[PDB]
Amino acid sequence: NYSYIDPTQLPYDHKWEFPRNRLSFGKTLGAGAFGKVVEATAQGLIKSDAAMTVAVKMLKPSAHSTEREALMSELKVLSYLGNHENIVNLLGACTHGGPTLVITEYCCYGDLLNFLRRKRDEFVPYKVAPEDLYKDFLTLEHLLSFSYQVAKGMAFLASKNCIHRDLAARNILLTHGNITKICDFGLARDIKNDSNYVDKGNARLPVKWMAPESIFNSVYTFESDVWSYGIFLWELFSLGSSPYPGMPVDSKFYKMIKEGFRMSSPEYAPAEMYDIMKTCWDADPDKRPTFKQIVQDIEKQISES
Numbered sequence: 001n002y003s004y005i006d007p008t009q010l011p012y013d014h015k016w017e018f019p020r021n022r023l024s025f026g027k028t029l030g031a032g033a034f035g036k037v038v039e040a041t042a043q044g045l046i047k048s049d050a051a052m053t054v055a056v057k058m059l060k061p062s063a064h065s066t067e068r069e070a071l072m073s074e075l076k077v078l079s080y081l082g083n084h085e086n087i088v089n090l091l092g093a094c095t096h097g098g099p100t101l102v103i104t105e106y107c108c109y110g111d112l113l114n115f116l117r118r119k120r121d122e123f124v125p126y127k128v129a130p131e132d133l134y135k136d137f138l139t140l141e142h143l144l145s146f147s148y149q150v151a152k153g154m155a156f157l158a159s160k161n162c163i164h165r166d167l168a169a170r171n172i173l174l175t176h177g178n179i180t181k182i183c184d185f186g187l188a189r190d191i192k193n194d195s196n197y198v199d200k201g202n203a204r205l206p207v208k209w210m211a212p213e214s215i216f217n218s219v220y221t222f223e224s225d226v227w228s229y230g231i232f233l234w235e236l237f238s239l240g241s242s243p244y245p246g247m248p249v250d251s252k253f254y255k256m257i258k259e260g261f262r263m264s265s266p267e268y269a270p271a272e273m274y275d276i277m278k279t280c281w282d283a284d285p286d287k288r289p290t291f292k293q294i295v296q297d298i299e300k301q302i303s304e305s
């Protein structure tokens with residue numbers, strides 16, 4: 001489940017322990033076969049007696065030993081990572097006197113994929129009007145900033161020897177001040193009813209975001225996360241369109257990927273962003289850029305713009 005690090009060997013700092021009786025649950029934000037993410041109010045988490053809204057990940061009674069272990073492993077990884085501005089941050093946990101509860105920060109605008117889809121008809125490639133500034137129009141400047149923030153968060157993950165394995169716009173959250181945060185819905189996503197996940201063997205996998213070595217050899221590395229970032233760039237500069245449009249995942253798809261077929265630039269991508277996508281999609285993982293190199297490339301593009 002984790003390539004370089006074994007999360008079962010990672011420690012859990014008991015400084016994160018929070019009393020479960022101080023949590024009041026609200027609506028369900030997302031749910032899978034064995035897990036769910038719920039909106040909650042945490043009392044006494046702030047130094048003053050002020051309450052705050054949090055997100056809580058938990059298992060359903062349908063979960064088995066495998067899922068119980070996986071939620072505990074997620075908690076250890078989050079505790080091990082520490083705080084980063086471009087990653088969804090750990091706030092606390094409930095490990096004693098009941099099922100395990102993982103408490104993370106609430107992101108007011110939800111997932112990036114749905115945000116892009118809602119903003120599709122309110123997109124401005126050029127500059128926003130001073131009077132129409134209240135309307136909240138999405139611009140090319142916002143898209144370049146989102147690409148930069150996601151590369152930054154990914155460079156941090158790699159420096160900690162962490163591989164995501166499911167990088168996509170659906171696993172990026174949007175909060176205040178146009179801040180994006182890398183996340184992983186994991187067990188709280190209904191993968192059975194999501195057409196972006198395909199039946200391949202005994203698994204349901206996100207094939208259209210996967211590097212060839214992950215599809216044909218089950219290998220996940222720093223370089224395979226870079227390929228998925230390239231697919232995420234295509235989603236972003238297409239304003240949330242599905243990748244490889246009009247093409248189903250079948251024998252013909254696997255053959256074309258192996259033979260070197262690649263998507264052409266999405267409608268709103270600057271040429272230098274499409275240049276990044278092409279290198280992320282190199283058949284040789286050694287020829288792909290690192291997330292650090294991607295960060296430096298986008299940094300130059302922003303300064304020039």
Ligand SMILES: CCn1cc(CC(=O)Nc2ccc(Oc3ncnc4cc(OC)c(OC)cc34)cc2)cn1
Pocket residue numbers: 029030037055056057074078087088104105106107108109110111173182183184185
């Ligand atoms: C990259 C390292 N890493 C982090 C993890 C843990 C993790 O990412 N868990 C996670 C993911 C998504 C969650 O869902 C939401 N959280 C906050 N706010 C939301 C707001 C929402 O709508 C307004 C909403 O709608 C559907 C969902 C929201 C909650 C927890 C694993 N690996």
